[PDB]
Scaffold this active site. Structure first.
Site, short mmCIF file in Angstrom:
data_model
loop_
_atom_site.label_atom_id
_atom_site.label_comp_id
_atom_site.label_asym_id
_atom_site.label_seq_id
_atom_site.Cartn_x
_atom_site.Cartn_y
_atom_site.Cartn_z
N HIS B 113 -7.53 -12.42 -4.08
CA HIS B 113 -8.48 -13.62 -5.15
C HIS B 113 -7.10 -14.22 -5.49
O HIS B 113 -5.96 -14.31 -6.03
CB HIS B 113 -9.07 -13.04 -6.73
CG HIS B 113 -10.61 -12.70 -5.67
ND1 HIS B 113 -11.74 -12.99 -4.88
CD2 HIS B 113 -10.74 -11.64 -5.83
CE1 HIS B 113 -12.27 -12.36 -4.53
NE2 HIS B 113 -11.90 -11.37 -4.78
N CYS B 161 -7.86 -18.72 -2.87
CA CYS B 161 -8.73 -19.24 -2.60
C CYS B 161 -7.63 -20.10 -3.88
O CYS B 161 -6.21 -19.78 -4.51
CB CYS B 161 -10.10 -19.35 -3.78
SG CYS B 161 -10.82 -18.73 -2.65
#
Lengths: 88, 173, 88, 173
Positions: B113, B161
């Site tokens: 992440h 991301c």
């Protein structure tokens, strides 16, 4: 005798999207960028340098959909072309 | 055939390898003799997190990258579910590995992440951040902290991301 | 009908040095990076795409001296090769 | 001859221009008809500062870049001694210029003192910072804020320090 060398050189970073923006991962197929990079490395490592392969990966993302991302090459200090010469 | 060490990677023939050396002059990174070289690669993949959702499908990414990097001639070290502090330590350990002295290049792969600031560690939450900056990765592998990879290509791959935005804008055709 | 497009694409930044590091400017000859870029653009715009020219510029800085710098290509989202085709 | 519009830039011949289109497929940026295109370039150069030393020799850089960009077919706008706020405003004004609609690309050149955080404006000091971040330049020229340059190359050139360090490390030969 001591000699001077550049502190940072011969680097290339390849990120899954542009700054501020999301990157997509299929829960059973894996990450879109990772799978696209593998496909392109497998196909083009023999004939193209890594910088070129990364460009080709970016090109493959050009047409956006419901889940769009644009991979980004960052902080490049490669002074030469990097060919993998697979098989050698 | 995919039965060989290179698996699914299309091979560069001896005719191709000499054509590349004629197309461009002394501006390609030199490769070391296949017999003696000790190429290393590191994959840090975070799947199991404390506070943020589980990265289902990460195992497909580990399998794919690991096999890919092996096919290209790299010995692949895989480390999973690490904090930013653990990642730093693991990266320092990787920069001290003696095999780099007899290697011609390296690959670093990060999968986790992520936010605008960097890559999320195991313990990351908005309340208590656990972030590895890309700046730190470069610093740990540079000529000062990793003299063994001086003049040698260092490729960094990051899946994450870089913020919350969908990354799109509308236009009329 | 509306269509989706990537918010950030077809960019290339070229900086005079690596992050944390100084860039040099001669008080009468001008900036080292600027003059080197002009020289390389003049020579190679006809035959090489801009990404390649920028690599060549980096290569020219490879041997450090008393005033060393390593130009850096940043945040690249070029999906194609950019040739200037000078004269056209 | 350097008497032409392209000055010192070596010209791409018609034989060369077709060879490039055969070497690589549909993966080159298309260029617009020379007769109708309106290519724009912007140079922001800071020389005269309030608190930081004078950038002697900057005029050689302005002359060089201006002539270079004209040679490549760009109409060059030159703006000097601006604050970060002035730079932003000038960049916004550049992204709204209607000539971009009938252009195939652009060049942005920034020349100034600099720090790790970004490019120094006219009024910059350690006490009161006056910094234009590179992030802002990209944001102002992207598809959202500059739809006229959608799918078109945007080249950014920055001359500036990115910190205090000499950028070197010692090794023994």
């Amino acid at each position: 005798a001591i000699k001077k060398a550049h502190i940072e050189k011969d680097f290339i970073a390849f990120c899954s999207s542009t700054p501020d923006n999301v990157s997509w991962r299929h829960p059973t197929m894996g990450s879109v960028f990772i799978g696209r990079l593998i496909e392109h490395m497998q196909e083009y490592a023999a004939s193209a340098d890594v910088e070129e392969i990364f460009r080709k990966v970016r090109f493959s993302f050009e047409q956006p959909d419901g889940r769009a991302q644009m991979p980004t090459t960052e902080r490049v200090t490669l002074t030469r072309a990097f060919y993998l010469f697979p098989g050698h | 055939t995919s039965s060989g060490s290179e698996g699914n990677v299309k091979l560069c023939s001896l005719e191709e390898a000499q054509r590349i050396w004629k197309q461009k002059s002394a501006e390609i990174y030199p490769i070391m003799d296949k017999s003696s070289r000790t190429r290393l690669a590191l994959i840090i993949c975070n799947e199991e997190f404390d506070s943020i959702p589980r990265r289902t499908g990460a195992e497909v990414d580990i399998t794919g990258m690991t096999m890919l990097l092996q096919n290209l001639g790299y010995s692949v070290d895989v480390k999973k579910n690490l904090t930013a502090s653990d990642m730093t330590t693991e990266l320092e350990a990787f920069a001290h590995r003696p095999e780099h002295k007899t290697s011609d290049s390296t690959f670093l792969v990060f999968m986790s992440h992520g936010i605008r600031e960097g890559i999320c560690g195991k313990k990351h939450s908005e309340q208590v951040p656990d972030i590895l900056q890309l700046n730190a990765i470069f610093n740990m592998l540079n000529t000062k902290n990793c003299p063994s990879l001086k003049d040698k290509p260092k490729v960094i791959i990051i899946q994450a991301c870089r913020g919350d935005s969908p990354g799109v804008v509308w236009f009329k055709d």
